[PDB]
Symmetry: C3
Subunit: 216 residues, 3 copies
Amino acid sequence: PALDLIRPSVTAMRVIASVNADFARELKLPPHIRSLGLISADSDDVTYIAADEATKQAMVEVVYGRSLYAGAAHGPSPTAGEVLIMLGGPNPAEVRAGLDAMIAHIENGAAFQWANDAQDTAFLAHVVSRTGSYLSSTAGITLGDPMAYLVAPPLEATYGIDAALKSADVQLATYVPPPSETNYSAAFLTGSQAACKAACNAFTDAVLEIARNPIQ
Amino acid sequence: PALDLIRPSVTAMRVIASVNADFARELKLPPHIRSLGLISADSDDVTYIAADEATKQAMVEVVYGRSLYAGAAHGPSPTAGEVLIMLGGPNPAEVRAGLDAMIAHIENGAAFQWANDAQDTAFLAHVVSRTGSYLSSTAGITLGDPMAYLVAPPLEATYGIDAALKSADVQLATYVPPPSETNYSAAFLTGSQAACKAACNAFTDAVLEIARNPIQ
Amino acid sequence: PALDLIRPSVTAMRVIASVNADFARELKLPPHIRSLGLISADSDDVTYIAADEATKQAMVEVVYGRSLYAGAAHGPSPTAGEVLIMLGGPNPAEVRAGLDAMIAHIENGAAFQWANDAQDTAFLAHVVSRTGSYLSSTAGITLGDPMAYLVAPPLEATYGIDAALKSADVQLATYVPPPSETNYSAAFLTGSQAACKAACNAFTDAVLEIARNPIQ
């Protein structure tokens, strides 16, 4: 039913203890990063948040992060999900700690929710109370500060973003207009933590409203 | 059966009477445009034509217009369809008039047609007799002049475009090679109205030919 | 079962004996190329290899080559497959010879293989012993030299590329990170022919390993 959590899952994972020199150059890895952890999951935004959480729980940084066209439900294989994260580290131990943190946060952390009882529409309104290096890489987001991670289908997202910015003391840090590779739209809002929560609640109310009466 | 109209439908709609300042800046809205109408439908090109028709029937202009990867049949939700149009206006009344025009033209206007009796292949060959601001935004298209809107799968489209340019007194204004986000290919042809109709008929004949015997 | 060949098929084909002048200009065709062969198939990489083989078997060159978003299984129509190749030639005879070579190599040539018995995961590890103009267009690849064509889902591909570069005397010529329009990842490796075969075998072993135990 509406507001129930969609539980994402890790679909594939591997650790490259020592990345090949040639491939390392093509990947433009810093000198210190010669160990690489690969992970794929069926939910892109939840995974992006987990990767960022990983850069707080270990000596890792995101080397690569991209989502798939049309999402997991139209993926080329079960191992693909709709994302691939490559975490880089100085050694296999740090990489595994990072990956462990990613697994924990993909299975029991930030999660999309059903916008309706029909369960054909999904959205994400999540507060990252303390951003790590990854999310703070984005222009407008400072390392350690909080943020609201808002994701929804094109129209729900546009309406909801406007509705969030009017509900709390927050600023638009990054706006990803529709479509993303997955055909969703996304926004990263900044400000106080309590304010970000507020924004998330207003976002949710907007998406649910459209879910109930999509055409007024 | 072949040549039957595919009837598209509006999947979601909303009006933002007064857009948030911050969001307005990120959207780069002109000073006069502070009211915003959002609409999503299951057919991208038909919707693009409706939006353009709207800029003739009201004091609106298209702020944003983009289609989804792999189309409506592989959309993330029923409200997404495969397009989102954001119409901008000076006030909610103009925006609603624009949206009303969009609805009318999405339900009873330009429409794709089945290329075969199997109904697994679709195309669009439509004459926009008088283009509005939106379509005329495209390089080569003058405000008010006519044009042929041709859309078909990669090969059908390439063959048909060539076939249209040989059938009537027309020029290639814009060519969108495959794939578009929806995996179709498209062309906007220019010239006299009667000539555009001619181009549409030759386009159709080419697509049907391939539909009957795809491999000669 | 695992390692069985996926047999691709041509989905649509046509020859334009004499391309329209206007369209020819928009396509930026060289003066000598005024005949054009169009072909679409359900497998993009196999088709890219066939097109390249065609530039060896006839006086043709690839005018256009692009794949579709989310692949054949989520294509807009059966004629679309997931690729469109436009071969350009000086006359219809050369174009038809090129197309004949493309058909033969799409039906009985380079072919993806199932990574698992479930047959939900596919990969490509193929040695092009003598590259033609098309593949050698890519920076790092010399006309006539050999190469390994490696393709797999995001994680399988990353792991396998690293694994290939460690298995044989080869260099990374081109790396296409995930996702491609089809949501796969790809690599073109260079070096001796025997070495390329080696790389293909190590690639395959890596993809199969992940297929058996995707999460270690």
